[PDB]
Amino acid sequence: MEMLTKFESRSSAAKGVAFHPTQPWILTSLHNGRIQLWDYRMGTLLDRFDGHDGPVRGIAFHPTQPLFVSGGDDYKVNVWNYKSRKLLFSLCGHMDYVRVCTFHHEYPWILSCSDDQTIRIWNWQSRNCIAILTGHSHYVMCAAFHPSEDLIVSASLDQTVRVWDISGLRMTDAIVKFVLEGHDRGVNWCAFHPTLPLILSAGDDRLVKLWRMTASKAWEVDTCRGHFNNVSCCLFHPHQELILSASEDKTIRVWDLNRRTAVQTFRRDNDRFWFITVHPKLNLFAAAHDSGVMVFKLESAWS
């Protein structure tokens, strides 16, 4: 495959990137504590947001509201209105670095996870913490809402990937359903497939593991082997049978979803990769690395 780069930013190390679902924008959250809002079709910096001290690793748009949420090493989860350009409020409660923060697609909820070993669910309408998910015995490096079920998946340096049942909170509020074992070192990332009952996880063991799950059970399907340093991030290609991973070995790797064989490796000479994301509708990906952010299309070779 080939990488068609549509936009690159040169900046302090990027930790997070978020695609706007309808506008041609990305938010970037940087090691220096700043959040950039870019138009990647025009190549223009639309806005800058100062609300954190230290790196900002969590960043996400609300799918419909004029909001985005940021999470920082200063423990704060900040909710912003990007139309009025105001910091609406800070959700305090986490006692260590925040690694991820996202909005739910239906309920007025924010999800965050932290080095303090907890996942927190907040109601951004009431500004209250409505659930604290405990059980992990080390940093929770990632957590994600399921796109169609009342489930959360989380990844921790305790070497486990947890799938939680949050049906109770939707109506005990949260109960661990699966404690997935298999990674031999800490797990840095976890992801759901947008329509298939699959889970991706990636960790310091250099492995990207593919899991499948039913309502009653789960199993490891296979492992993508090849990265030669910590894997920072992984995701499903939404519109193709492909897996993508990003690693401190300075590569983004594309893998066959059906066979978990290597399809294509992209390298950067000097930049470790910290994060990758995909647009919910378009063949559009973003990667965050030591020197900034890149937005690109993934195309078949000599297309």
Residue numbers in the entry: 1 to 171, 200 to 331
Task: Give the exact sentences the study uses for this entry.
Hence, this loss of critical proteins has the potential to compromise ER proteostasis and generate cellular stress. This challenge to normal metabolism is overcome by the activity of the cytosolic coatomer protein I (COPI) polymer, whose repeating unit is the coatomer, a 560 kDa complex of seven distinct gene products (α-, β-, β′-, γ-, δ-, ε-, and ζ-COPI)25–31. Overall, the coatomer functions to retrieve the escaped “client” proteins, such as type I membrane proteins, from cis-Golgi back to ER by retrograde trafficking. In particular, the S protein – a type I membrane protein – is delivered to the ERGIC from both the ER (by anterograde trafficking) and the Golgi (by retrograde trafficking)3,10–12. Here we utilize recombinant SARS-CoV-2 S proteins and tail peptides, including constructs with enhanced mimicry of the coatomer binding motif (clientized S protein), to elucidate the atomic structure of the S-coatomer interface.
To gain insight into the role of the basic cluster in stabilizing S-coatomer interactions, we generated alanine mutants of αWD40 Arg13, Lys15, and Arg300, which are equivalent to the β‘WD40 basic cluster residues Arg15, Lys17, and Arg272, respectively. Biolayer interferometry (BLI) assays showed that Arg13Ala weakened αWD40 binding to both wild-type and clientized Thr1273Glu S heptapeptides, although the affinity for the clientized S heptapeptide was still 2.8-fold higher. A 1.9 Å resolution crystal structure of this αWD40 Arg13Ala mutant showed a binding site architecture comparable to that in wild-type αWD40, attributing affinity weakening to the alanine mutation. F Superposition of wild-type (white) and Arg13Ala mutant (yellow) crystal structures shows minimal perturbation near the mutation site. In contrast, Arg13 and Lys15 residues in αWD40 provide the basis for basal binding to both wild-type and clientized S molecules.
